[PDB]
């Protein structure tokens, strides 16, 4: 090629056009969204078993569902959660890359098989199966600002009015509502009910016989008798709708002339299905929605569209209802795109400038201007092909690639320009001449660079998914670049470039350029003299290399090594845990003081506060609420005392005071989707059936033994504390003595105290649920237990205290199980300075001290990093061997390839330095850039050596070749490295919105860039002469 | 449908939901059945067992499992008056007639409500009047449909949609196929003129 | 149940769930006075029939708890939806020994 | 260009497919016999006259 | 898919099976016809029975 | 999946009562290891022989 396309500029141009086109069509219809699916996909099975112990929900629904939940493809592990409010969750975690639609359907199939094994009330409730990934698009609040509506009223609104339209909005995936539909609430008074010798169970039965659908037949149904003529359906009665219809319904008819109905005995009105979770946006009571993006949608379009839909409904809303949008991914997925077309612009601009500055031509200036965008276009096409998307990482992927993309354009032009000046060949001549020298190398370097980036795409787990994003977007960019810098560029060169006088390096020029050329020219000679001196005096340097190498080896183990960069998304979390036995109303108070403060004392940074009671990241329960703090946009809170990490630093202090409610306060970890990216994560498991008590003390020994270990820090239980519960105790003897029914005993507790889902009732079309339970003042203290009367043999009401006998005993409000056997989740991290594998190696040991029958499993990120980590060395070796082999075949030598590979440290040292200096971590963004810098460094090196080789061959000294090759190479090296480090600086200084990551790459590259330029120029000729000599 | 038997281009226009139908609105005063003896709407075990079928259980029959079915005599569910004939047994043991709690208020609603894209709907069909094409017919319909009480739109479905869609591609089909041809000639002939000579 | 009861207690719920499935072209349900209903979810021309079926089934399972207990303890049918019949294969009686 | 816009626009050509449908719908309420008679006339004024 | 389709029609059967069977726990499985292996457990000093 | 069960009972063994050993009565996998090993071997021979 090249030669072939040098003569066929139009064909060449066509190939451009088609890839340009493919780019475009693609570019405009790629899904756009913030992150791909990093997390290992998970399905969640969940019901509530209205007012039931953790114990019952664990041994009655979890243990049974779990026993059936096997023979499911791609399953990695499974964990459960049985809670005090009576809710449960089985979380089934499958392998990355698992079709989430098959994952889900296999799970709800095993679920379906296990249903008739569950208790009635649970079945009637209906068990929900869904995809548990937390990649939320926006969460929208619906709030009652005059505090007229209760939460329950709002969420019923949401279900009835907002749900179905929002459902039909373009690009809306799965969403969750903060609460549900209304239910016909009914509130049994124990006294009012006792005075007519009536049981709560009587009421249930009454409603069941009195709130039904009359099934209805057909007038003139087939078979009919001869005649018939009129065939019409007969419609009977539907069901009760009004609260009144309910207050009616006859319960007893009295000995005299009268009749008793539900309205005498209980209160009745529409209400909550469940009262466990209460939540409010800035004090004001509120529900809301958490929306997911549908698969392939556009995060930008559909956010705009969700809004549209809601706006079209804001005209119709009851007075004092506001729909505020607290959290929204749009600012960031926008920020990321501007911050790319901006640096792709500044880059093509910057290239143009240094193009001119060195090559005084104007036509030359725009060969790179055509080629770079022809490539970026294509790249979005290849991305399309491989089935990726436009997201945070595929975007940085492009920025990071621009180095490689730009260098490829510069080398090709500067070389024709050079050959033309030094040899006086016509542009067309210089082009083929030039490609003669370059094709070879180029093709080869594409191989080299594929080996540098691909093995990273073979990692597994979340870590791997992230690398694949970079690796593929990059080697795609580079592969395309090579192609167009083989087909288009030389063609453009031969066409658009203008002949230049042999010998004319232009210092006669005068003016500024005359100043420059004379100047640069002198520098070049200096550089030559530099090299020439080094090649004279070898050993000294070779050893100063060996120092710089050690410096790098030392600089590694000394950098803090984290998974991701710390990010300021617009968000902050606050956890509240009021001590065991607190009431939500007593927890609510903490979460309110919390909000007042943030909103008042802190509003320099804080924009809105959403506050939940009876739910947490430690579990659900009346002692548990928390706060999702929404910050105002980064522009509106400059200065590093208004960063999340700062606001959160001081909200610790502000709340440290409380001697009545532990209150953690922390930032979310950058990729929400992945929960908790730090330290380590494990479950302790009761294998040999040893029991909750032993297990509980294995947890506690483990903990107060890690606390006193060098290698670990911050080691907690994720779960919940054990607490007092009320061990109500029946007596079979003295209860059949009063001749009381015993099925009647505990059927009354279930209903009065636990509540009971009795029935359906069409409310405004929608069928909704009818719940029966004791009025609240009737069920708050042991003494209220006595308020309750059951029927015996004769019509005599027997009080509960008659055969009852309460007792404080303590159990658990959160029963955890991991892989079928009961568990306790521990979290922690390694002692500052130390690493994850160290901490596991510690934990590995302190686990051995545990009671027999208790074992353990690693889970979440700790599970993954055990696997991905065992595979690194294999990849690094393959990467190293393969590049080696490519260099061998290019250099027709087993030894020269070393003179290129030894540049690597020279790259990395600077990288490490800058990163460590600016106080940053050894993370994924640093890792990937480090591969960019060493990659672009190998390129430089490859061309120098290749030239030195071509010359040495065309007949001249090893040392004379090395020097003649540098010099020849110096100018494009300087050009492309000046172009880039300038193009990257913004990321280095980047400010707000993704800026944390931009710092991670800006700092890294340009550490390596600076050193790899100012050093390979000297040491590459050393190494080449060095190994050649040898 | 009026305007459609009138319009000269259409031919055979029809609906798909079969109108409204007479439905026998039943009625009970819960209080009166409680006054007699039959308390609680237990009455269903009579209304639906007699006037609808009632799959009770299974019997094998020549080695194959069919259903056992309960339903009233044909002559006992033919007229509003046949409901008179049905005596609910009592809590004492006596036959309360069905006239103690009746009220057949011969009413009427819909036999088949259709629905399309989350709004309610009616589906009309119809061909085009001979010598004309579905496009003509289609264009015609988009007129007769303006005279529709605002707040009532329409949607094409089926063949119509498939045709609406077929027609919209065409522009681009031609553009693209034109363009490819151009470039391939360019490539193959190393000319711009030659391509232009052929587009012309 | 009444056509309108049926339209409002089932069709309404499940239909809203199907909103949002991938490559969805349109939905068209119908409810009858005889109890029966039918939602027909049409997809775009390249959608794999079996993933579409599964996706339907996945959403369907979510609607379930908001359905009448007669409906719910009953079992909802889901199936691929051909418009046309390939052939009617019939049987008739040479003499007259077998009734309809 | 003038000639284009002047041509009518179909989808698929009509085809003597070799089969046809009759579709009967007696007014909202009729008995089995009502429909059945209608259905039995058109089955004659077709199998006998066409 | 085979399994998704079978269970799906198995589904429409379930409401008509006897409680005693439903409660018993039905297994829909996609295995290969033959036994791969038997994992055995055996008592060493006889403390454990069959 | 042989390897993987070998692996599950592998780290369940440390929890079994003192009077109990896991054993592999029936097993099919020995034949495939054996089979492909035997071929490997007659390949290595063929190559020395050739
Ligand atoms: C972290 C992120 C994504 C950046 C963010 C920032 S702000 C925000 N959203 C919230 O701040 C917020 C604010 C209020 N919430 C709530 O009030 C509830 C409580 C909801 C509730 N109340 N009664 N029932 N449910 C809730 N769930 C706390 C409970 C566990 C989670 O799952 C769901 O609640 N899913 C909804 C499905 N329901 C409950 C409807 C199932 C059903 O049909 O019964 C979320 N989550 C929230 C979440 N998320
Ligand atoms: C499964 C397939 C995997 C393939 C992986 C192999 C990667 C190969 C990398 C591309 C190398 C091409 O290398 C090609 O051949 C020889 C090197 O031997 C070189 O040709 C050379 O010959 C002469 C004299 O020998 C020199 O003046 C000069 O160095 C160069 O012109 C060119 O630099 C190049 O055209
Ligand atoms: C011209 C283009 C050339 C560039 C392309 C080069 C691609 C790089 C190849 C690496 C891909 C191979 O995939 C990788 O294989 C190795 C070796 O079996 C695996 O490694 C596995 O076996 C080795 C050897 O027993 C173990 O030390 C290792 O811990 C284990 O995981 C990796 O887990 C897998 O990810
Ligand atoms: C024109 C430009 C072309 C550029 C495009 C190049 C595409 C190359 C992408 C290769 C994708 C590799 O796919 C990835 O393989 C790795 C490693 O084997 C898998 O990881 C898995 O493999 C090995 C098995 O030996 C295990 O050690 C590891 O724990 C496991 O999870 C990933 O789950 C899979 O997704």
Swiss-Prot record, chain A:
Residues 1-9, 360-365, 414-441, 497-538, 892-897, 946-972 are cytoplasmic. It is found in: Cell inner membrane. GO terms for molecular function: efflux transmembrane transporter activity; xenobiotic transmembrane transporter activity. Its main location: membrane. GO terms for biological process: response to antibiotic; transmembrane transport; xenobiotic detoxification by transmembrane export across the cell outer membrane. Induction: By growth under severe iron limitation. Residues 29-339, 386-391, 461-473, 558-871, 918-923, 992-1004 are periplasmic. It comes from the Bacteria. Disruption phenotype: Disruption of MexA, MexB and OprM significantly reduces active efflux of N-(3-oxododecanoyl) homoserine lactone/3-oxo-C12-HSL/PAI-1, but not N-butyryl homoserine lactone/C4-HSL/PAI-2. It is a multi-pass membrane protein. The chain crosses the membrane at residues 10-28, 340-359, 366-385, 392-413, 442-460, 474-496, 539-557, 872-891, 898-917, 924-945, 973-991, 1005-1027. InterPro entries: AcrB_DN_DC_subdom, Acrflvin-R, MdtF-like. GO terms for cellular component: efflux pump complex; plasma membrane. The keyword Chaperone does not apply. Export of antibiotics and solvents is dramatically decreased in the presence of the protonophore carbonyl cyanide m-chlorophenylhydrazone (CCCP), therefore may be driven by a proton gradient. Antibiotic efflux is inhibited by pyridopyrimidine derivatives, such as ABI-PP, acting by binding to a hydrophobic pocket in MexB. Component of the MexAB-OprM multidrug efflux complex, composed of six MexA subunits forming a hexameric tube, binding to a MexB trimer, which interact with the trimeric OprM outer membrane channel protein. OprM is thought to not directly contact MexB; instead, MexA joins MexB and OprM by forming a funnel-like hexamer anchored to the inner membrane. MexA may initially form a hexameric ring complex with MexB prior to OprM, then OprM undergoes a conformational change as it contacts MexA, allowing the periplasmic gate to open.
Curated annotation (Swiss-Prot), chain B:
Disruption phenotype: Disruption of MexA, MexB and OprM significantly reduces active efflux of N-(3-oxododecanoyl) homoserine lactone/3-oxo-C12-HSL/PAI-1, but not N-butyryl homoserine lactone/C4-HSL/PAI-2. The chain crosses the membrane at residues 170-189. Induction: By growth under severe iron limitation. It is found in: Cell inner membrane. Residues 190-195 are cytoplasmic. Pyridopyrimidine derivatives, such as ABI-PP, are not exported by the MexAB-OprM efflux pump, bind tightly to a MexB hydrophobic pocket and so potentiate the activities of antibiotics such as erythromycin. Belongs to the resistance-nodulation-cell division (RND) (TC 2.A.6) family. The inner membrane transporter component of the MexAB-OprM efflux system that confers multidrug resistance. Functions as the major efflux pump for n-hexane and p-xylene efflux. Has been shown in one study to be involved in the active efflux of the autoinducer N-(3-oxododecanoyl) homoserine lactone, thereby playing an indirect role in quorum-sensing; but has been shown in another study not to be involved in efflux of this autoinducer. Over-expression of the pump increases antibiotic and solvent efflux capacities. Implicated in the secretion of the siderophore pyoverdine. Component of the MexAB-OprM multidrug efflux complex, composed of six MexA subunits forming a hexameric tube, binding to a MexB trimer, which interact with the trimeric OprM outer membrane channel protein. OprM is thought to not directly contact MexB; instead, MexA joins MexB and OprM by forming a funnel-like hexamer anchored to the inner membrane. MexA may initially form a hexameric ring complex with MexB prior to OprM, then OprM undergoes a conformational change as it contacts MexA, allowing the periplasmic gate to open. The chain holds residues 703 to 902 of 1046 of the full protein.
Curated annotation (Swiss-Prot), chain E:
Disruption phenotype: Disruption of MexA, MexB and OprM significantly reduces active efflux of N-(3-oxododecanoyl) homoserine lactone/3-oxo-C12-HSL/PAI-1, but not N-butyryl homoserine lactone/C4-HSL/PAI-2. Induction: By growth under severe iron limitation. It is found in: Cell inner membrane. The inner membrane transporter component of the MexAB-OprM efflux system that confers multidrug resistance. Functions as the major efflux pump for n-hexane and p-xylene efflux. Has been shown in one study to be involved in the active efflux of the autoinducer N-(3-oxododecanoyl) homoserine lactone, thereby playing an indirect role in quorum-sensing; but has been shown in another study not to be involved in efflux of this autoinducer. Over-expression of the pump increases antibiotic and solvent efflux capacities. Implicated in the secretion of the siderophore pyoverdine. Belongs to the resistance-nodulation-cell division (RND) (TC 2.A.6) family. Pyridopyrimidine derivatives, such as ABI-PP, are not exported by the MexAB-OprM efflux pump, bind tightly to a MexB hydrophobic pocket and so potentiate the activities of antibiotics such as erythromycin. Component of the MexAB-OprM multidrug efflux complex, composed of six MexA subunits forming a hexameric tube, binding to a MexB trimer, which interact with the trimeric OprM outer membrane channel protein. OprM is thought to not directly contact MexB; instead, MexA joins MexB and OprM by forming a funnel-like hexamer anchored to the inner membrane. MexA may initially form a hexameric ring complex with MexB prior to OprM, then OprM undergoes a conformational change as it contacts MexA, allowing the periplasmic gate to open. This is Multidrug resistance protein MexB. The gene is mexB.
